[PDB]
Amino acid sequence: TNKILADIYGRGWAFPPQFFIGERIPYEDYSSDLNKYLSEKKIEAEQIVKIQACIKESVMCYDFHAKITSTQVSKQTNLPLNILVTYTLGDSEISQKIQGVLRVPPQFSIKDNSRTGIAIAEGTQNVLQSINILFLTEPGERIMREDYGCGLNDYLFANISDELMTDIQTHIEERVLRYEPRAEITSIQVNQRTNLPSTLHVQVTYALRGSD
């Protein structure tokens, strides 16, 4: 269901920006086809299709656009197996390689730090992160976008009173309506902390567009 939500609400960079570089592949270790190795080691031919199905399923969870083209065995693991998987993304010509561990039902595991790129937010997390960025941005900070932002700094140092709590609640409602069409605010709660009398805690509950 996470795929369905991601397609409906979109996906993009995660906030705050994060970067990863995957571990280097020791290419001088994988020079033996997986199927030929399995057949040579007198493995069952009914096992092989189960083995390949396990590889395809595990890769699909890792990246559902993948299309497996090659499979190789590490020469330092001759019956815990280390596998280098080669795949192409969709119908593109771009090819990528990924390490994996196969255990003989067969089990296939992926190396942990194998992805290089950015962190992405999908579906519900994208909308939740979107509202969070709005609260932390004040108008006039964005270049050429001098109106985007919530603008809660204007209510600091004001006396904590029913007037201030009402103003904060209504201000949040108006700005989210203007700058976040994918979310619907259902309730806003403003309370004063007992241990810190000078701080206000705001509880905001949101629902997704067309969720029900």
């Binding site: 970067f19 280097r24 969709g90 593109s92 010509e93 771009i94 290089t116 950015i118």
Partner: protein, 50 residues
Amino acid sequence: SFYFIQENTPEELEDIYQHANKADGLLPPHQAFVFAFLKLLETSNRLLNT
């Protein structure tokens, strides 16, 4: 190794940049960021060359 993933060369990335169709929307986002920036600088380069 972050801008060029694994066994990627500038020759390969340049080919993808010239032909946007051969990625069909599956290029990694950070490399698409680089391609977008290179498109921005094309206008400045064109003005200078006059």
